[PDB]
Amino acid sequence: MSILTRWLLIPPVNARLIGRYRDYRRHGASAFSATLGCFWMILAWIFIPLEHPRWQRIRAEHKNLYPHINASRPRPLDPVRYLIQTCWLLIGASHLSAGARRLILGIIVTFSLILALICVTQPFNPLAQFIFLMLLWGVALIVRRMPGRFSALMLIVLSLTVSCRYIWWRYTSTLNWDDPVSLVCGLILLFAETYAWIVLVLGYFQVVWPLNRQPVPLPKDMSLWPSVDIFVPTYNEDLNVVKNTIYASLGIDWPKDKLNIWILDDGGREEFRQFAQNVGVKYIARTTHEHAKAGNINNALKYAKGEFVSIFDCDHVPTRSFLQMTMGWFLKEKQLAMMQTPHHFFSPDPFERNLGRFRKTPNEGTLFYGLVQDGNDMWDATFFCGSCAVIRRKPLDEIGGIAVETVTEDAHTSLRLHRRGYTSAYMRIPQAAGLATESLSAHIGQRIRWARGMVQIFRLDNPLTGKGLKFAQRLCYVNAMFHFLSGIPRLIFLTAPLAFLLLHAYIIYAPALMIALFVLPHMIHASLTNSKIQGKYRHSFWSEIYETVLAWYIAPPTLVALINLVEEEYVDWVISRPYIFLVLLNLVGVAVGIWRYFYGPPTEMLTVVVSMVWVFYNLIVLGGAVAVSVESKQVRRSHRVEMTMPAAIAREDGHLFSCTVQDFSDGGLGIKINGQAQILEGQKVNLLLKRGQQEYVFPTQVARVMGNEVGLKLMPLTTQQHIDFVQCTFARADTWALWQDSYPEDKPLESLLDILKLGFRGYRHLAEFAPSSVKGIFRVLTSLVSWVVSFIP
Amino acid sequence: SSLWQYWRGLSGWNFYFLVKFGLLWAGYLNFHPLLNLVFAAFLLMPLPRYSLHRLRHWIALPIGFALFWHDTWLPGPESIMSQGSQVAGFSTDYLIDLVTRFINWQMIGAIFVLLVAWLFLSQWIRITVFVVAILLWLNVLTLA
Amino acid sequence: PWFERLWYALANHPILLAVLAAISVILLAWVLWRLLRIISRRRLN
Amino acid sequence: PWFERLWYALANHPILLAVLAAISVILLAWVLWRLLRIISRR
């Protein structure tokens, strides 16, 4: 029958069709798909001039710029996608006297507050409110592009005016006093939002003015420098994690006559005793194990004799500049009794490891140790955070040592020191790096312990109502304690629209337009103000993910306390149960809402849309939370730190070649050689590292050669070689500061896109494994529709 | 040429057309869909050299100004030329009162917010396609 | 009714209220900036 | 007739007395739930 085709169709087109059909048959594509593709091709080339060289040049780089379209994979409704993408592109764009000064301040402040009260309590019609919204939002946007602290204050005040307006409107004209069911839940949501507003106001106060304390130079004479004792308390950590801490301590740039390093062991392990004997540091193994780490430190204080005590965790390695950058203030302020240093984690956190964003997004704790403690510094409320700190022993002996009551002993002892009149200080430069939690369960547990301790301090010591303590200190401490009571409001927020969608209950009795015109400015201004203030500390919309991960596990213990090596990828079902339950509830709500959009009253058309967008936001948040709960592969014994240093390699025949170190770990290095000079996968190599102008040699064995990249494994080193290696790789006083300074800034829209992709990735992750089999089908359907829509944006 | 990559768009004239559309919606305009469409086609006419593009913009600026004046309900140039001497000879108080009555702050605010929205859109959503579509729709409605 | 009178005065004036709010924001920011500078200088000494 | 006078009071004042009634109902429900749990555990 090929003769008929040859006669009817010109042979070039016939050959093209036959070849395309054969290619799609070999790839499994349907013959009907090939026929439809050819029909579209011919109808286009006759109804669309594809001969234009402009479109040919666009097609030349179309694959690189738009790799989401495949010419060899036809799909139903392809021309609709082409038209939609084309429409998106065409749419898209390609001094004075005291009394007079006080009176002037009084009049200015009262006038400004009267104007703010008028702005807050002015009823509007929707158009007037919208104009007000656009104007104030534009003012915020303009002030955003203005570096400094005055702009931060302006944004704080503007946000406070907007939030006070929102709360005033909610408390005046949203509570519907008609129903007994549309009242209790509405007031519950109102109380949740009032708590959130209070937390926001106290946080704005806390970081209103970071102090930016600077190190004070030490005296030139080395005989005036004070004696420092370093404590390293260990209970069950392996020696491989404390060795680097001890080696970095032995290399601290402090006079060895005035530096004693102690290893505290609550396990009575003989390996630690022998290690202490070999390296020359002290050792204490108490017979009675009471009060845990606080008791260990107290027993150590019973023997140590030094002016200052510096507490280090097992995994935290100090830089050599730590004592020189810290001790200056203790000799300047006689009242000082505590100094704090940031906590940095070179190990990838569970979020960073699982979600694949390690060096892109900032760490969870760099907002606290980067901005919050600096804010607490101004009000003299910088509390002990466990490690990377120095305490003067004379004040610490008066208070009876480290507090032993709560599980968070550091905050308690800092609170006692502040209540006895002593001050505290904070230094911003990261001078010690530790290991992050190895799993989501560990993060949940440590946060639970911290929250339990903070609630215990709130119930027992009660910073609000105690003894001599400044009001700013009270506010800072109560804000830190309230931060851990946010689980219940988060649960309310995640389960609020399900009320109306499931059981008709008007939580907010206002038209959807007015809700959009009042709630939205609050959120927009809060996001902008935080993005300016906590700029290189936390990306936008990420705090909700952490909050929702913690909420279900922090709310029960906090409430009770108020009353009284990944071999294979897997999903932590036990940890992820609450997220899956909330996803099921929200999606059954969205099914009911889809029903109500048609079979419900027509007047409730925008309200259902508002509830549905709320449910969609909830689902994105919970999907990100689930995405956290899948553990990525981890077979590296030691974690690697990406640092670029020039180096050199020495062979046994005496040839030296230059190389660039790209990453280092406890027992290896990774280097890059321009051309793969001379190295094989078992040869011994001497590695030359420079610390300033001094060069150090370390024996290595080659483990992997993959072209330019070479992996090296460290040979058994002596103690001095260990110290030198730590001083050349880990305890460098430039790695952590530049690490924190290299964090990208906060882009709210890009952050939203990343979080949406993360939620989609989490849904796809759960589309593979399923605890309750039934959920499998639903998850697969959701992922299917979601990627179909993504292909049709 | 092979590409004719000279359809750069209306660029700043999108705000001009948006102002005209808003004034027409307000009801203060004697709109001329044909003249607006011809002016838009003149603005979108592809030109090879950039110098010719700049010259075309410079020539179209007074043409657009005159078209905007014509499409309004303000009096024609004859009255202005006949009453310029009288306006010059009038007292300052009457001129100030006329200026105050001529300026509407609501109109100024609407124009400013429209300009800000146009800036935001031209940063994210191009406007030439929308302006052309609206002009074509108006022309079709008027002719039919 | 004085609050009613004040509201009716600015019932449909969003531009004026935006100007007043910006003025209040700038002035309160200045006062807070002065106070926080004073407290910061006293804090670092 | 405590229910009659309670309803009359709620009709008189629907703002403060409504909140007070809701708080009292919540407290009574919590107390009754605790008592029932204790009795069942015995």
Ligand SMILES: Nc1nc2c(ncn2[C@@H]2O[C@@H]3COP(=O)(O)O[C@H]4[C@@H](O)[C@H](n5cnc6c(=O)[nH]c(N)nc65)O[C@@H]4COP(=O)(O)O[C@H]3[C@H]2O)c(=O)[nH]1
């Ligand atoms: N035999 C051997 N080969 C090594 C080693 N380190 C790197 N490679 C090789 O180099 C590739 C690039 O890995 P990367 O740059 O570390 O970037 C890695 C890393 O970010 C991540 N990754 C893979 N496995 C692990 C793991 O066990 N732990 C961690 N933390 N990340 C891992 O995935 C990326 C891609 O890794 P691959 O697809 O496996 O591809 C790896 C692998 O072929 C090593 O210690 N031993």
Ligand SMILES: Nc1nc2c(ncn2[C@@H]2O[C@@H]3COP(=O)(O)O[C@H]4[C@@H](O)[C@H](n5cnc6c(=O)[nH]c(N)nc65)O[C@@H]4COP(=O)(O)O[C@H]3[C@H]2O)c(=O)[nH]1
């Ligand atoms: N900084 C750095 N160190 C390197 C590199 N290559 C090797 N090492 C060091 O050499 C040790 C032995 O690695 P291996 O023999 O390849 O044997 C490796 C390899 O089979 C596997 N592995 C670890 N990470 C990766 C990875 O990213 N990708 C793959 N494909 N395998 C990995 O786990 C084994 C244990 O590795 P580790 O526990 O990391 O212990 C590593 C590490 O200390 C490198 O490119 N950079």
